[model samples]
Target: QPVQLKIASYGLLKNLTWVSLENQVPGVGEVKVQIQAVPVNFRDILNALGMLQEHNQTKLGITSVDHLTFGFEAVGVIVGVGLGVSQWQIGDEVMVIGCHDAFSSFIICSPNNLVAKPANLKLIEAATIPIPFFTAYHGLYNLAKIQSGERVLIHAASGGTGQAAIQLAQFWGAEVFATTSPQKMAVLREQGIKHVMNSRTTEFANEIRELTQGKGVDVIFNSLTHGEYIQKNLDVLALEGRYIEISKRKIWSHSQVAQKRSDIKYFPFDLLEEFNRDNQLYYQIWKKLIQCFENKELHPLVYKTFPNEDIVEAFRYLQRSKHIGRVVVTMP
Candidate 1:
């Protein structure tokens, strides 16, 4: 029999449930993965709560079912392989991406979507890497094209993507500056961050200018979805600085000052319309992310873990905003 854990409507952890069923054989080009860990990210909870799309937004013929899934990424062991599957073998540990009904004990996926896990990391941590890691990788490597010795600013430095961005920026030899709560300053410094802005105590733009001796940062990777942060970011970005905004909502209407800055770049990844009809760019980015993971150049941040029965409680904890990184639901 096959079993799976799932999140229903996404209110609290109590919404998660587990069920058992008979396993079926895989078809051609499909492989069965025995799930080890699944991540409960903020984006997943928001989407499940209907905050991602409104009722009228569906008039464009966009179906909610496509967006409706248990989780986005997971680390699993290949238990069975279908016809013509040559890239992977049974018992191989792999990280799965691209949203495949992941709140389950077992998942059947295309072979190409699975990347072999790095030997140095555990399954639970690997599960949390794909989504947030990809976002950081695309933002720094693709969107910003950050260079060594350049100044890089990261907002919300304690979250999954924020933390990942900080490390990647530093790894690229950029002077890393991060905005985090005062309580998290020590942690950020311990993570090799040299410049820290206490968002609660001081103005971030002013602090940035002071820290850089009025030169400002070359790239602003902002995670704040609030309008004021977006508006104030312009005050700290250099003349040719790039602004990579990844927000679920528009914090501010695009301003002329930001748009005409000559180096400002914005990518609303959640907006489905930005990509070409073929989604080639999407797949290409995903591929590069997998390569980074496989090469051990990236590490996932897992703030907490919950067993199958405590899945609902996971959502409750996530709502409290106490975690500094990704929250995960593990299959025991």
Candidate 2:
């Protein structure tokens, strides 16, 4: 029997449970993934709190409130491939995308939703790619259409998405300006990020303005929206710049921002909506992102892992933000 973790009810960590299940063979056009590792994001905690019920309802599924399955991505080997599945075969190491139930020992998914894992990365490291990489890629590549020699600023540079944005933006030839907690500055610098600065206060805006010689940044990969930071961020954008806003909390409307600078293009991105609306296009991106990794221009974000048995603690660790890297949960 394969095993899976489920949120039996809403509201607290006490509601999560580990349950065993019968393994099913893959049907036509599907493959069975023998899961190795999955990463826990803040979204999973939001799912446990029932904050994403409406969002989830409009997308993949939440069959019932009694047994809510919540993980979104994973890395594993394809142990079974059904008849008529042309691209994948048994023994292929792959990353599963849009599964929504990846915190399990096994999953059945279509080949379109799977990307070949970079052979160099371990299963645990590979698990970090999907959500963070997809979000970062969607913002920088899709919305901003990030170009070479552009100046880009990334806030909250310590998280998986931030780190991914740093790599992708730089790989696209933009000079990166990054901000993070004082304690987290060392890691970013060691990774060759020369523009590292403190994220706890508003000084980063002044720093970016001065460094860019008042031309300001061409694009901003921002998540911070509190107090002075929001307006300060807008103040730094160059003429006709792209603002790829990752925040879902209090934010500015198009006209509100246009009142400040009419030439700026603002986007508030949500990766979930994109996947639910058109996963086929995402599959193309899924493949191309792996190619970027293979060329060594990109790499997995740093991470610390826990056994699947301690998934509740994994969620707690990520919630506390005690770890600098992404928090991973591995199957035995």
Candidate 3:
């Protein structure tokens, strides 16, 4: 027997039911994990609120909506392994990455979907790393091809993914410019970013242009997808720049980017679609990500841990305030 959270009915404060699920044998290539910690992502919040339906299309191997069980990443201990699985054993502690349904007390996935939770991190901290770190890694390294001494601006700097981009950008020797709401401004500054701006306004475009001596930034990690905001991102993008669109809803089209700034590249990335397409690709990055942590090039995940019983409050907090890090919900 297992239990998970879901939008049972749906509403403003959605009816999140703790639905019970029957245990099933994992596929021959898969292993069973007893999930203990789940990082609450923005998509999880949006799904619970019935937002961003179209953006989730054909993702997670789901056709219609599956606000049924959410959370794309979690930390767990492998409790059972399929006969065909060779690399992992039942006693391993691992991070479950890129799955659509992971909020449950238990989950099943292939060995490629997991990385041994590093001995240095507590389970809650490990749970907070995968989604945000991978998003930053793929956007900056895979798409942007970010280089040393280049300028990189990360919008929503206080959020989990935003911080990940900042950390990865710094480690790669890029200059970091960050934007966050007025309330969280100091929190970002204390983290050693050289440039900071208010996320609530569009003035950052001018600030960035002047600060960079009118050349604009080489790469921009965008999560703020406002109509005015997006235009400004393109406005301040440098010649031959790369703009990473980690945001899902209200995405830009190829024609729009070509018309606006033909010299710059805008990539609308869906990590789920990419990782789910090939776990081998995920494996390549997983080792690199773990290696970064091993050498202490990146900081540990910043997150707030909430008990499973207080999940509703966690969701409420995530919706109402822009917390400095991701939120994790722990099961009993």
Candidate 4:
């Protein structure tokens, strides 16, 4: 039997439950993974509260299920491989990406969609890498094409994706600015990010403009909804700059300045859309990220780990939103 976490209708953590199910064999082009670790993200919380149901159901046609499992990525060992799968074999350590229902003891995924676990990383560490790193890489390198010595601003710098963006943008030689609460400002500074702002008290847009000597920034990595700093974001973009919206929570509508600065490019990044559009690009970027890890150019931070059975407690803790880095759940 396989132990899996599920939600009935998605209202809160109390709505979450665990269930045991009989094991099933993998189909062609699929491989069965014995999951070792799963990382929790804000999206998991939103999905649990049914905030994403309308978009998921209306757009993707995903219906309510009896035991809907949650999670997007996990690290595990490949215990079984189905016919027509060539890249992976049984006994390989791998991390699965772009999959739902990852909060389970066992999961089936396509071999081509799996990232080979790096030799230096534990399952818990690898579990936190894919989503955050991939999102940062696509936004900074692929979308923004940020150049050396360019000024870049990253909102919500304390979260997983935010941290990844800070590191990657810095590594690419961009001058990085980030916004977080007053408490996490020291943490960001400690990570070598000198231009950190207290988003709670300061108007980050004006601060960024002043810091840049009124020249404005070359790129902006924003995830929050429209009202937070959307206008300021448009206001701060330099001529022919780029704005990469990494969040899908809300639609991005153009502002007056956005129309005025028509040369400034706006890219709403959707990881799923990019992966579906070109699996080769996804695989290439995944390999590049692993290389960064192996070379010590990148490191993923794990804030805490909870036993898989203690997932409800984990969810509750995540809701408090004090974590500095990734929170993971481990299977015993």
lDDT of 3 by residue, 192-223 (tens): 88788998899999999999889999999998
- Candidate 1 lDDT over 76-169, as tens digits, reads 8999999998878899998877653677778887776677776777888777677676678777888789999999888878887887787688
Candidate 4: list runs displaced more than 4 Å. 65-67, 226-228, 253-260
Error of 2 at 255 (Å): 3.5
- Global fold similarity of model 4 (TM-score): 0.95
lDDT against the true structure, per candidate, is 0.72, 0.84, 0.84, 0.82
Q: Ranking by TM-score, best first? A: 3, 4, 2, 1
Regions of model 2 farther than 4 Å from truth: 58-64, 249-251
TM-score computed on alpha carbons, candidate 3:
0.95
Per-prediction RMSD in angstroms? 3.7, 2.3, 1.7, 1.8
lDDT winner between candidates 1 and 2: 2
Residue 193's lDDT in candidate 2: 93
Clashing residue pairs found in predicted model 2: none
Model 1 residue 86 CA deviation in Å = 3.3
Error of 3 at 176 (Å): 0.4
The runs of at least 3 residues in candidate 3 whose Cα sits more than 4 Å from the true structure, single-residue gaps closed, are 55-67
> Which 10 successive residues of model 1 have the least lDDT summed?
270-279
The candidate with the higher lDDT, 1 or 4, is 4
Which candidate model has the greater lDDT, 3 or 4? Answer: 3
